[PDB]
Design a protein around this ligand. Structure first.
Ligand SMILES: Nc1nc2c(ncn2[C@@H]2O[C@H](COP(=O)(O)OP(=O)(O)CP(=O)(O)O)[C@@H](O)[C@H]2O)c(=O)[nH]1
Ligand code: MET
Ligand SMILES: [Mg+2]
Lengths: 23, 470
RNA sequence: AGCGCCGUGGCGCAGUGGAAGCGCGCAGGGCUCAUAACCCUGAUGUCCUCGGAUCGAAACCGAGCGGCGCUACCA
């Protein structure tokens, strides 16, 4: 079950968007 | 106005420090996660498998913080022959109020029992659930015996896949099948690249990775997005290690043994030899507690060739001087990890890749050296690691008499010749000595496209013994 | 980390125990109707830091700066 894999991915993308809005 | 070093010192003092191990603790009651054991030694060996130029030492460094040498000038950049190591401790926050995913935190071995919680707003203290050792494995197509030996060492797996690259990486599949070979089933899938790749490519790569692992032995392998440089999603890795991966049954009921993979000559240049150290062999203890002060011998040891061409095997008895593990010299050694056994073995014996893949046993046991071994072998249908550009991945052929095959018995790297080929059984003649202890899960590789390629698995069923010369 | 090697005038080599070196560079001049070839003169140095003996030291040595070759990652 990879359902608890997309959640960390969402967290990673959100962290990237907050830290690096230019990218 | 307190300097950072004094601040770390008061943190270490408040954390309880690193208490010395008891000299002679009751070994019947010592479980692998006891405070006397886990504060100063790793008990589970975790190895990183993956394709070349993906970054495995960096991931462990982000987890732990201990660097993996990367020596030998030319090997400072391309690939490292010998295994890289790092010590990691899994500290879990005791406070329930703070979210569970960020409760976990991986720290260096130099840390104390109870370090303060670095999350802003949490006065609570961490609890060390377990120390974990990291046996990094070479991920290249030429160095193949090294990764098999590391797999013989390691107990938990972390598979590394790139995101922006091609999904079906063959080196990673070879590594996964190799781990599948030796009764090891706990693998965690780790996506190295998450920052430089998009949202829908994320689902596409997730689906591809899921489709790859459907028919292999491992079925329930978790997947985690990780980053080697951003230093994020490290706590969830420790969470997965804690939850998914238990401790295989290992106690002191079993006879002591050792499997040395690295050699280390402790000879400090420039200083006077009147103050010198011994020779250190880096070995995993898969079974049996070891202590300060023992008599131990390597079984194959000295390999000499006489004038008649016969191979003479002199076992190398040695009095162990110390058992270096974690950071501090210990009084008892906890099996199930790599410990640096520093003994009176001649320093030149530990200089080069000489103690690479060799079994060692304490006095009170007699492991048997074999020169012709009877194995039972099984093969896969296709080779692993070849990039055919769209045609029927190389199909595995049946064996031929008198061919050199790399027969990795556990950690040993041997080039054997084939004597007889049955449907499932075979006989191998080894010019490089090999030894037998119990069963010794074996890996098999051959040569078609130059560099060695894995083919299948084997298990020893019989052999011809050579008595060690006193 | 140590063992051997070295320290431009831009460069590669040389003597380095008495004070600024060769050749190639660059500038200028000469030869030729004219160019290259050839012939002259130059303008460039803390010949890597701190010191020493000595009427003398880039040079002879030592408490170090820098980079190679070698053992070689030395828990
Ligand atoms: N953009 C990006 N680069 C990464 C990431 N992880 C590692 N790298 C890069 O991979 C390169 C190789 O690092 P390294 O860990 O030494 O490779 P290796 O895993 O030891 C080689 P092998 O797999 O054969 O053992 C590094 O330059 C590193 O910056 C990542 O997550 N993102
Ligand atoms: C291979 S884990 C480290 C081995 C040895 N205790 C040093 O340090
Ligand atoms: Mg490595």
């Amino acid at each position: 079950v990879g359902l608890p894999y997309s959640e960390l991915l969402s967290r990673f993308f959100n962290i990237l968007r907050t830290n690096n809005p230019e990218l | 106005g307190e300097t950072e070093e004094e601040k770390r010192k008061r943190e270490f003092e408040e954390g309880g420090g690193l208490p010395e191990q008891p000299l002679n603790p009751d070994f019947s009651k010592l479980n692998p996660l006891s405070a006397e054991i886990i504060n100063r030694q790793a008990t589970i060996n975790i190895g990183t498998i993956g394709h070349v130029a993906h970054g495995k030492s960096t991931v462990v460094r982000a987890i732990s913080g201990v660097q993996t040498v990367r020596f030998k000038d030319e090997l400072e950049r391309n690939i490292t022959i010998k295994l890289g190591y790092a010590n990691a401790k899994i500290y879990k926050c005791q406070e329930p109020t703070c979210p569970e995913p960020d409760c976990y935190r991986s720290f260096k071995s130099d840390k104390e029992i109870s370090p303060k919680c670095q999350r802003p707003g949490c006065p609570g203290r961490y609890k060390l659930v377990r120390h974990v050792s990291f046996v990094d494995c070479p991920g290249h197509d030429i160095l193949m015996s090294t990764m098999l030996s590391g797999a013989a060492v390691m107990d938990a797996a972390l598979l590394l896949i790139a995101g922006n690259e091609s999904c079906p990486q063959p080196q990673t599949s070879e590594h996964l099948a190799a781990i599948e070979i030796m009764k090891l089933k706990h693998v965690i899938i780790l996506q190295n690249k998450v920052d430089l790749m998009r949202e829908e490519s994320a689902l596409e790569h997730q689906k591809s990775i899921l489709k790859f692992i459907r028919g292999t032995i491992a079925d329930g392998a978790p997947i985690v997005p990780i980053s080697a440089q951003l230093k994020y999603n490290i706590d969830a890795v420790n969470e997965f290690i804690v939850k998914t991966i238990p401790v295989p049954p290992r106690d002191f009921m079993i006879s002591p043994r050792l499997i040395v993979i690295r050699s280390f000559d402790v000879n400090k240049p420039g200083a006077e030899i009147e103050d010198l150290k011994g020779g250190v062999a880096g070995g995993s203890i898969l079974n049996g507690v070891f202590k300060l002060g023992d008599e131990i011998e390597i079984r194959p040891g000295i390999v000499t060739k006489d004038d008649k061409g016969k191979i003479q095997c002199k076992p190398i008895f040695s009095n162990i001087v110390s058992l270096f593990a974690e950071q501090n010299d210990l009084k008892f050694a906890v099996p199930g990890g790599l410990i640096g056994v520093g003994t009176k073995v001649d320093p030149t014996l530990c200089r080069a890749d000489r103690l690479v893949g060799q079994v060692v046993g304490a006095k009170g046991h007699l492991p048997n050296i074999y020169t012709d071994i009877e194995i039972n072998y099984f093969l896969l249908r296709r080779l692993l690691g070849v990039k055919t550009d769209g045609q029927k991945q190389a199909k595995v052929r049946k064996l031929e008499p008198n061919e050199v095959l790399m027969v990795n018995i556990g950690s040993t790297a041997t080039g054997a010749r084939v004597v007889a080929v049955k449907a499932d059984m075979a006989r191998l003649q080894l010019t490089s000595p090999a030894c037998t202890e119990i069963n010794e899960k074996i890996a098999l590789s051959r040569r078609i496209e130059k560099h060695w390629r894995l083919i299948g698995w084997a298990t020893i069923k019989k052999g011809t013994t050579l008595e060690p010369i006193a």
